[PDB]
Design a protein around this ligand. Structure first.
Ligand SMILES: *[C@@H]1O[C@H](CO)[C@@H](O)[C@H](O)[C@H]1NC(C)=O
Ligand SMILES: *[C@@H]1O[C@H](CO)[C@@H](O)[C@H](O)[C@H]1NC(C)=O
Ligand SMILES: *[C@@H]1O[C@H](CO)[C@@H](O)[C@H](O)[C@H]1NC(C)=O
Ligand SMILES: *[C@@H]1O[C@H](CO)[C@@H](O)[C@H](O)[C@H]1NC(C)=O
Ligand SMILES: *[C@@H]1O[C@H](CO)[C@@H](O)[C@H](O)[C@H]1NC(C)=O
Ligand SMILES: *[C@@H]1O[C@H](CO)[C@@H](O)[C@H](O)[C@H]1NC(C)=O
Lengths: 217, 298
């Protein structure tokens, strides 16, 4: 594991309101410009949301698990994007420590060991996700820009909201489910977002980075 | 306005004119996901009262008015809020109960009541907010030989508490001596019914859905269903779109929204545009004409 910098990555649509050719000064939880990003199965904390980037070719990433203690005594959220449809299941799954399958078969979901109440269920190249939790709602935003090359592209990409869910649970620890990735932590900030003719976010400016990027705000 | 009876020459300002609305438009989203309580109300077999199924109802739209006509509920008692208020608060983690009990027993399923079933089988709290519904089931829960498949508790060395379920099958003790097996004062605390199609009205089986439902509060609030009306364009109307309420004229537009957006806003705050949840068409909202009504006198 190493430490790198995120140029201008992590900017997403804050709300579901259309705006045409404008500049909006908003306050929200974001990933600060040029913050320190952990580059990587340890357990990582969940401070007011996380930003997860993944780059792979072998498709080893298979999902995520979230919870407060993961002791099978409090509700845990499992997201598995196996091969065709994504399964979201919210309960006290008795997960195994290391769910790994050799290599065909595409079976044997022995990730968990026992079942419980299980209230909520749901079905449906530089993959970037933002996971936020607020007001009892879990919000997952995603973007998939096919990388042209092999380095990390310092560029701007807005993240459209993939799903908003009323799971209504509590989460403080999150892990990763395997068969390179980047982890960053969000903070409250104020941003200036630029909107084209088509309610697309094309550029963003922070308001706590530099002297110039405060006079701009 | 001038507070005088002698108006001189000039153009005097006066009241204001507005174009008042004439219709009301309400357009809630497509009505797709609703629960087939068909599985909850039209099943072949139900559970015994001692092992009552706490049926879970979630993630759908409340449409049980067909059950008003398809199933003529002879019993309908609601001790909580009025049904007319059910649109203000909906339910997501709501529970339902399925009972198969006798005839002269539906009166015992009521708050503050006493009896064998109320004390040993199913006890409701004093502050009970729910609806009891019952209906006769001779045609599908009675048999000439006898429906020996529904059981009920008779003996227990304690009283019950609101919303408690017991499945215990251990023998009941009545005397001082320790007990191993039946025989003497040591009875089995489970006894079945003997429903037949030719019983009297008070002994025929009643399928009793004690909708002891509530559990309204939840991060999610799957709701009851809303009525929608038609849409009127090029006219001054009072509109309500998914909780956004206003007045104006809804004309055709050419803005290219993105698939995840609902409303639109101008440079300041105002809801310039909107998207209809059903036909998925951009609609421009323009405010009603208003201004001054100035007067010219010589
Ligand atoms: C993380 O990156 C920031 C850049 O803003 C730097 O100031 C900080 O020292 C870094 N932390 C490390 C390398 O441990
Ligand atoms: C359902 O929830 C209750 C309490 O929340 C728990 O005691 C019970 O074990 C759960 N059911 C299962 C099958 O785990
Ligand atoms: C908006 O979408 C249209 C779709 O044809 C595209 O031509 C245009 O370039 C986009 N952006 C602007 C600046 O309007
Ligand atoms: C839902 O959308 C379909 C698509 O045309 C339409 O046929 C149907 O009538 C809509 N339902 C409602 C509630 O109007
Ligand atoms: C209740 O559960 C039993 C099994 O425990 C089942 O046979 C019966 O059909 C169920 N009835 C209802 C009310 O769904
Ligand atoms: C459902 O039950 C009602 C109750 O009488 C009945 O009228 C209706 O035909 C039933 N529908 C089906 C298909 O089970």
């Amino acid at each position: 594991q190493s430490y790198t910098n995120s140029f201008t990555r992590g900017v997403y649509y804050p709300d579901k309101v259309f705006r045409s050719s404008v500049l909006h000064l908003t306050q929200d939880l974001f990933l600060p410009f040029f913050s320190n990003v952990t580059w990587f199965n340890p357990v990582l904390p969940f401070n007011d949301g996380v930003y997860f980037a993944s780059t792979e070719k072998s498709n080893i990433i298979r999902g995520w698990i979230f919870g407060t203690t993961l002791d099978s005594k409090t509700q845990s959220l499992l997201i598995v994007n196996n091969a065709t449809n994504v399964f979201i299941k919210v309960c006290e799954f008795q997960f195994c420590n290391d769910p790994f399958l050799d290599v065909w078969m595409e079976s044997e979901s022995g990730v968990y060991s026992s079942a419980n109440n299980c209230t909520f269920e749901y079905v449906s190249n530089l993959r970037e996700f933002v996971f936020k939790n607020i007001d009892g709602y879990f919000k997952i935003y995603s973007k998939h820009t096919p990388i042209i090359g092999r380095d990390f592209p310092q560029g701007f990409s807005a993240l459209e909201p993939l799903v908003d869910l009323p799971i209504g649970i509590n989460i403080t620890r999150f892990q990763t489910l395997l068969a390179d990735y980047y982890v960053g932590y969000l903070q409250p900030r104020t941003f200036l977002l630029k909107y084209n003719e088509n309610g697309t976010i094309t550029d963003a400016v922070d308001c706590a980075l530099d002297p110039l990027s405060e006079t701009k705000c | 306005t001038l507070k005088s009876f002698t108006v001189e020459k000039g153009i005097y300002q006066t009241s204001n004119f507005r174009v008042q609305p004439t219709e009301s438009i309400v357009r809630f989203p497509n009505v797709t996901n609703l629960c087939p309580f068909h599985e909850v109300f039209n099943a072949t077999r139900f559970a015994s009262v001692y092992a009552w199924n706490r049926t879970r109802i979630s993630n759908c739209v409340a449409d049980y008015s067909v059950l008003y006509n398809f199933a003529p509920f002879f019993a309908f008692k609601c001790y909580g809020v009025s049904p007319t208020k059910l649109n203000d608060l909906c339910f997501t983690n709501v529970y339902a109960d399925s009972f198969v009990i006798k005839g002269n027993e539906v009166s015992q399923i009521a708050p503050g009541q006493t009896g064998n079933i109320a004390d040993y089988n199913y006890k409701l709290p004093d502050d009970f907010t729910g609806c009891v519904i019952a209906w006769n089931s001779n045609k599908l829960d009675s048999k000439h030989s006898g429906n020996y498949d529904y059981w009920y508790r008779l003996f227990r060395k304690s009283k019950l508490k609101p919303f408690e379920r017991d499945i215990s099958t251990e023998i009941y003790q009545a005397g001082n001596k320790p007990c191993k097996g039946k025989g003497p004062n040591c009875y089995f605390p489970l006894q079945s019914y003997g429903f037949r199609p030719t019983y009297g009205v008070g002994h025929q089986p009643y399928r009793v859905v004690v909708l002891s439902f509530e559990l309204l509060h939840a991060p999610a609030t799957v709701c009851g269903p809303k009525k929608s009306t038609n849409l009127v364009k090029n006219k001054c109307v009072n509109f309500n779109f998914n909780g956004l309420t206003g007045t104006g004229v809804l004309t055709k537009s050419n803005k290219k929204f993105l698939p995840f957006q609902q409303f639109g806003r101008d440079i300041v705050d105002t809801t310039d545009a909107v998207r209809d949840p059903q036909t998925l068409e951009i609609l421009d909202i323009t405010p009603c004409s208003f201004g001054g009504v100035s007067v010219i006198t010589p």
